């Protein structure tokens, strides 16, 4: 059985940033991809970075794109979502899914974590 | 499963009047045969039109929040002029059921009805050691129904504990908005005998859910309504007792 | 008496065997059979009944009705497919809960064809155009549109016809295939890209669904009977 | 080759005989443990008998394999496994044993004591296996009431069919060392024919 | 590829098919020096086909397999026989295997315990296993191994 | 094995034209046959003279100290035009070939070498328990090649742990610089599988060792090259995939 | 019950046996063979394909690839054979390396003929001329060309054909040898001497090698199935 264990979420700051990441077990990394969605408080599941571990070749979201950063760990079995310079709108119970692969889509994935909130407080 | 494409609009109105009845129908042709197999007599009192006729139910009402809606037979049509009544005055009693339901919307409106015929149709409550359970009354809701929800029918368990998506297996046909407008199903007579009692066995089950959801074009109608007609089929009953009038 | 010699085997009992033994109720009055509509044969032939794919499995849509709902939503023409799917039964968790994967996993083989069936449900009016590809085993994933346009793939008309059937052939290496993750045999991909784009008129809905179908074929096989039944 | 025109499927059938009905059920299963035993003392609990009602519905390997259909007629074929031990740590002896083992047909008197009447039934089947040889094997033919066994009933009157009830015994009498037996059940569902099938429980029973 | 004898002797060739038959010469005796007491016992021995869940504990659901063969050999009779066919998944068995995907061919697992339940005086035992391929046909020869293994 | 005698000089220069590419072989005749069998389809896409006609790997060097060379197939061939192309579009494979090695020397050199194509010829590294061990890359030394020694393969155990004098259990000749300058084997398609995948499995192995040391009449041509051309005979492919170009 | 009676023999176990026991697979789909070039029918075949004998075991040459090359060199016309070899299989170290020999370590007994082919490797323009010669069983090793001469021999030419073939005929006592060391059955010697000399034209090197092989006949068979693995 594939687990993927969403680790790196909690209430930062309006600009703080927060890292996160995703021990893969079950398969070769490699064979799969890696990304993110997020879905914000009674909203929709909502894409924000993904690549392929293989062709490390990059994807972002358009309203995410530039503060935020993927990152693949083939040693490990991990990913690492840098998400910098955060907003009140990246205010989104987050979740990662290994990848067929490779980019932001509706689902176009399988594997699914269990959910873990972040929430970009503000004063 | 049912991947099909008739027309799409409307060609032929071909009405079927069966003795007192009429119905005209969308067209007539697209209709799925249960198994492969035409209700047929046992190889009796065979009243034919007396009791082989068509038959209205309630119409229902299928909204953007429904979540699906179920019934049973002969059940339902146990209110029905002499079906009703050949089905209390017997002991006996087999039937085929022609179970033809209609759903007319616009070119405007979008969505996907699943009509499904489960044979055998135990609703949902996992005891397996004692199945049954929920009383008589409330396993028979006669010619109103019952309903699915997000007695207690899970929608994506088919209300009996099982993934909705393999529903499939059941004869069927889907109303989908854009192509038909009509299903058209044939149910044979289906049970571990020959013929049974129908009062408290309960052959077939007609149950509807939305494989889609209903969205209308910007303000329209709230709602579109579903129609079920069912006929019984090759009938025959064993053998009237003190006519016992209510 | 006549000579008769016990070889090995003698006493023991093989599950498998098949012998005939002592019937304890002689004359008994078997009820005779009746046809009831709907006899089976064989295993293979409820594969070859289509069944419904639950393609979206995320988070909050597995284990719900929307697991079946693919939305086809108001968003850029990336090349980023719609959908994607491997076709390796066991080894992806969308194609497993199939009744087609159902019977797949209580044998070790399978060989032959499957058929994919896409059925679109949105408005009459609504019109535009999907390309559903293919790409063979051990090809990597098809990205973009023009990557998946070079291989078998079929260009569906939402405007004319409501449903699409593309039959997945047997480009396969062995006889016979691992229903298992295995990479000396692996599946390869189906998926969906934007040929054209979605057009509604008027202010119908934006937003519709596709439901999919799967199947098997004549030719689809399988082999040595295998379980797995927990408590 | 490469192809994905729309034809019926493609070519003709490629073997398909071990996966066939007949087959898939062709494996007899375990479907039961009955515990006896042949005690010296007055042990009203384990009391000789054990009793079990002849159901699939038990297992669980089985029963879902059973699930997929919703109607079955099948020769059921069972064989038994009979296995025994010394309980006590005593150097105490025991001779070779003879167990009762009683298909008692569907809708009959189940028994209670071991020392009943019903336990001598002049018309219920009876097998008497003697400990340390090839274990027991008996045939019940099709003993269903309708035209097919109902796996999933819809209706009033879960029971289910009945396949009718086991009962075994030690026949040898008392003897100071005390020794258990395990009785193991296995059912082939032999010339099984099905009707009218359902998705699969996904679930736990 | 355990033993010697029969290793060898299969080596002088690349691919082969060959029925399978097995026969178990089952042994028992009392390891504690002690007048202790035991029932004639009951084995219980499993052919469980290549690529299927290998039992751990004695316990698991995996010991009963609805589909997998078993084989109930009482103590003091004729060792057990059964015959497994040609149960490859290529069109030969492959002796030498080069290229990449060493795990053979995998010819399947036993599984053997006792079925007889827990007596004060432990006896143990031994199964000897023997193969004999009957119906067995071969190609494209190699010079045979000259050293040890 | 091989005791042949043909002629011993030259006679006849008879030229295999085959697609694009010319030979000039020595003569014609004398060629063998590995078991009796010639490359047959599979009783598929069957790309003919596109993908079957001959290439030429590179060139080598034998020398007083040349220990041997070896080669895989397809292997070897992975780097070559459409033949180069076919492997890696497909997820399919089956092939012949016609390893016809030519070595040229005058009537003044001695020596001798025995062409041995070893089916499914996996090389040294005593790991029974875990065989393939080796890198595919060293495993796959594409058309440079690899060479025994006196990733390590000993001559005398033939590269493999069995002692070379028993190599002659496969299909050989001896090109013996006294008699013949070519050497001709047709090797058929040999696997456990009717078809399989190229990429990954090997199945043939040229391995061309020294049965005798080179020597050269006084001072003359310190060395003498070996070439090596492989045809890929009746061959089929399925099924293209996303010509995934590069 | 029918009236049989238990012989001795009964639940006894032959490893030689032949019996139809219970098949654990019922209706398992075996995968049909295809026909793979080199399918062997018996072991005999494997004999009739030319192996090269090791013939310089020497201290230092055995266990390497020297072993395999005789070497002519230039020393002095003395009757010495350049080569002896003694037809008594694994009675002696040389004829027990082939692959004919590995047949026989099999065996207690072996008849029929035997085929010793020997291939020159020398300069094309070198000549000369030997003599293969052949003495029948229990006779003495022929040490001298005179006395090698008087039996059965070959006079093999190295200027004109390069490959001599001298097949060793079936002169024995018995109609089955051993394969052993045994006086009463002793194989006899093959050897080969200078009929000529060897002639060089220019600077040519003066020390070339000659190759040896060893196969089986269509009259060779085999008996008594024995065997030797150590561990």
């Known amino acids: 059985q594939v687990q993927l264990q969403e680790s790196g979420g909690g209430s930062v700051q309006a600009g703080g940033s927060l890292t996160l990441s995703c021990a893969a077990s079950?398969?070769?990394?490699?064979?799969?991809?890696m990304g993110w969605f997020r879905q914000a408080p009674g909203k929709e599941n909502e894409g924000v970075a993904a690549?392929?571990?293989?062709?490390?070749?990059?994807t972002y979201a358009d309203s995410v794109k530039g503060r935020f950063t993927i990152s693949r760990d083939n040693a490990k079995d991990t990913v690492y979502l840098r998400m910098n310079s955060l907003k009140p709108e990246d205010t989104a119970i987050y979740y990662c899914?290994?990848?067929?692969?490779?980019?932001?889509?509706?689902?176009?994935?399988?594997?699914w974590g269990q959910g873990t909130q972040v929430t970009v407080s503000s004063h | 499963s049912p991947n099909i494409e008739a027309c799409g609009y409307s060609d032929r109105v071909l009405q079927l009047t069966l003795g007192n009845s009429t119905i005209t129908t969308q067209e007539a042709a697209n209709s799925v045969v249960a198994y492969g197999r035409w209700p047929e007599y046992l190889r009796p009192t065979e009243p034919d039109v007396a009791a082989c006729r068509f038959y209205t139910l309630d119409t229902v009402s299928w909204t953007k929040e429904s979540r699906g809606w179920w019934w049973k037979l002969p059940d339902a049509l146990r209110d029905m002029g002499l079906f009703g009544q050949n089905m209390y005055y017997h002991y006996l009693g087999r039937s085929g059921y022609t179970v033809h339901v209609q759903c007319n919307a616009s070119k405007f409106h979008q969505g996907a009805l699943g009509v499904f015929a489960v044979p055998e149709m135990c609703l949902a409550g996992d005891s397996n050691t004692t199945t049954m359970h929920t009383s008589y009354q409330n396993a028979n809701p006669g010619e109103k129904g019952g309903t699915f929800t997000g007695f207690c029918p899970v929608d994506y368990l088919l209300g009996n504990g099982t993934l909705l998506g393999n529903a499939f297996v059941f004869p069927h046909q889907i109303i989908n908005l854009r192509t038909n407008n009509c299903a058209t199903l044939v149910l044979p007579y289906v049970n571990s005998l020959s013929i049974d009692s129908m009062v408290k066995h309960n052959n077939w089950g007609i149950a509807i859910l939305p494989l889609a959801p209903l969205n209308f074009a910007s303000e329209s109608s709230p709602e579109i309504p579903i129609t079920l007609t069912i006929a019984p089929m090759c009938c025959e009953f064993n053998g009237l007792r003190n006519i016992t009038l209510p | 008496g006549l000579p008769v010699m016990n070889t090995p085997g003698s006493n023991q009992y093989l599950t498998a065997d098949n012998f005939q033994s002592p019937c304890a109720l002689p004359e008994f009055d078997v009820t005779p059979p009746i046809d009831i509509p709907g006899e089976v044969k064989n295993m293979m032939e409820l594969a070859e009944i289509d069944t419904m794919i639950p393609f979206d499995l995320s988070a909050t849509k597995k284990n719900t009705m929307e697991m079946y709902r693919v939305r086809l939503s108001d968003k850029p023409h990336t090349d980023d497919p719609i959908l994607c799917l491997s076709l390796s039964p066991a080894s992806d968790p969308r194609l497993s809960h199939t009744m087609l994967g159902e019977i797949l996993n209580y044998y070790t083989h399978w060989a032959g064809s499957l058929k994919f069936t896409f059925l679109f449900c949105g408005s009459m009016m609504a019109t535009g155009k999907l390309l559903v590809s293919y790409a063979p085993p051990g090809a990597d994933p098809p990205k973009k549109r023009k990557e998946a346009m070079l291989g078998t793939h079929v260009i569906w008309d939402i405007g004319l016809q409501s449903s699409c059937t593309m039959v997945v052939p047997w480009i396969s290496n062995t006889t016979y295939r691992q229903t298992i993750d295995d990479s000396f045999t692996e599946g390869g991909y189906i998926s969906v890209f934007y040929q054209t784009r979605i057009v509604v008129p008027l202010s119908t809905p934006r937003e519709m669904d596709i439901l999919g179908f799967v199947s098997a074929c004549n030719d689809f096989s399988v082999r040595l009977l295998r379980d797995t039944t927990h408590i | 080759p490469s192809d994905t025109v729309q034809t019926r499927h493609v070519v003709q059938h490629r073997s398909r005989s071990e996966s066939s009905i007949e087959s898939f059920f062709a494996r007899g299963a375990c479907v039961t443990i009955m515990t006896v035993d042949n005690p010296a003392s007055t042990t009203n609990k384990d009391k000789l008998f054990a009793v079990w009602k002849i159901t699939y519905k038990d297992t669980v390997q089985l029963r879902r394999k059973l699930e997929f259909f919703t109607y079955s007629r099948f020769d059921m074929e069972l064989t038994f496994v009979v296995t025994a031990n010394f309980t006590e740590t005593n150097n105490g002896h025991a001779l070779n044993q003879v167990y009762q083992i009683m298909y008692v047909p569907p809708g009959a008197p189940v028994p209670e004591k071991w020392d009943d009447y019903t336990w001598q039934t002049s018309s219920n089947p009876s097998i008497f296996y003697t400990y340390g040889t090839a274990p027991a094997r008996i045939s019940v033919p099709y003993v269903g009431i309708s035209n097919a066994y109902s796996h999933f009933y819809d209706g009033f009157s879960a029971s289910l069919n009945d396949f009718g009830i086991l009962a075994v015994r030690v026949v040898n009498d008392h003897n100071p060392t005390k020794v258990t037996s395990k009785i193991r059940v296995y059912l082939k569902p032999k010339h099984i024919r099905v009707w009218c099938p359902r998705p699969p429980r996904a679930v736990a029973y | 590829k355990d033993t010697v004898q029969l290793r060898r002797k299969l080596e002088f060739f690349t691919y082969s098919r060959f029925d399978m038959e097995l026969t178990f010469v089952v042994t028992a005796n009392f390891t504690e020096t002690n007048n202790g007491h035991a029932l004639n016992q009951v084995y219980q021995i499993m052919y469980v086909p290549p690529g299927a869940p290998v039992p751990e504990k004695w316990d698991d659901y995996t010991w009963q397999t609805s589909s997998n063969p078993s084989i109930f050999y009482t103590y003091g009779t004729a060792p057990a026989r059964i015959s497994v066919p040609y149960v490859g998944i290529s069109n030969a068995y492959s002796h030498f295997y080069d290229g990449f995907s060493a795990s053979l061919n995998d010819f399947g697992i036993l599984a053997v315990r006792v079925v007889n339940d827990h007596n004060p005086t432990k006896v143990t035992s031994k199964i000897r296993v023997y193969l004999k391929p009957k119906h067995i046909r071969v190609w494209c020869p190699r010079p045979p191994r000259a050293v040890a293994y | 094995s091989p005791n042949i005698e043909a002629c011993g000089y030259s006679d006849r220069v008879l030229q295999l034209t085959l697609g694009n590419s010319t030979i000039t072989t020595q003569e014609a005749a004398n060629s063998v046959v590995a078991y009796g069998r010639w490359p047959e389809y599979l009783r598929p896409t069957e790309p003919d003279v596109a993908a079957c006609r001959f290439y030429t790997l590179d060139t080598v060097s034998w020398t007083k100290e040349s220990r041997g060379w070896w080669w895989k197939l397809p292997d070897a061939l992975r780097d070559m035009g459409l033949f180069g192309q076919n492997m890696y579009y497909h997820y399919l494979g089956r092939s012949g070939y016609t390893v016809h090695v030519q070595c040229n020397a005058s009537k003044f050199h001695q020596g001798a070498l025995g062409v041995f194509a070893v089916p499914e010829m996996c090389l040294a590294g005593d790991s029974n328990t875990t065989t393939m061990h080796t890198s595919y890359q060293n495993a796959n030394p594409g058309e440079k090649g690899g060479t025994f020694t006196g990733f390590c393969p000993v001559d005398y155990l033939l590269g493999n742990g069995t002692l070379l004098g028993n190599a002659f259990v496969f299909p050989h000749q001896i090109i013996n610089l006294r008699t013949n300058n070519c050497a001709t084997l047709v090797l058929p398609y040999v696997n456990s599988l009717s078809i399989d995948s190229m990429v990954k499995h090997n199945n043939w192995g040229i391995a061309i060792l020294p049965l005798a040391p080179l020597n050269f009449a006084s001072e003359s041509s310190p060395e003498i090259p070996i070439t090596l051309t492989i045809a890929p005979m009746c061959c089929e492919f399925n099924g293209l995939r996303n010509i995934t170009l590069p | 019950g029918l009236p049989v009676m238990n012989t001795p023999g009964s639940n006894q176990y032959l490893t030689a046996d032949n019996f139809q026991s219970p098949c654990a697979l019922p209706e398992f789909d075996v995968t049909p063979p295809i026909d793979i070039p080199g399918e062997v029918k018996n072991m005999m075949e494997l004999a009739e394909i030319d192996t090269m004998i090791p013939f310089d075991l020497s201290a230092t040459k055995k266990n390497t690839m020297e072993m395999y090359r005789v070497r002519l060199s230039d020393k002095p016309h003395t009757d010495d054979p350049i080569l002896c070899l003694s037809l008594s299989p694994a009675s002696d170290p040389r004829l027990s390396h082939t692959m004919l020999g590995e047949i026989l370590n099999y065996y207690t007994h072996w008849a029929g003929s035997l085929k010793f082919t020997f291939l020159f490797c020398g300069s094309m323009m070198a000549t000369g001329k030997l003599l293969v010669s052949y003495a029948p069983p229990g006779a003495d090793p022929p040490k001298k060309r005179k006395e090698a001469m008087l039996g059965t021999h070959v006079i093999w030419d190295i200027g004109l054909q390069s490959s001599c073939t001298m097949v060793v005929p079936w002169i024995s006592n018995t109609t089955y040898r051993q394969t052993i060391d045994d006086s009463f059955t002793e194989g006899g010697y093959i050897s080969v001497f200078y009929q000529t000399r060897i002639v060089v034209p220019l600077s040519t090197p003066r020390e070339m090698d000659i190759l040896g092989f060893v196969s089986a006949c269509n009259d060779f068979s085999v008996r008594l199935l024995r065997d030797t693995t150590h561990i």
């Open positions: 899914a290994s990848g067929f692969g490779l980019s932001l889509s509706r689902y176009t994935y399988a594997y």
């Open positions: 079950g398969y070769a990394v490699s064979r799969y991809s």
């Open positions: 690549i392929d571990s293989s062709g490390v070749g990059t």
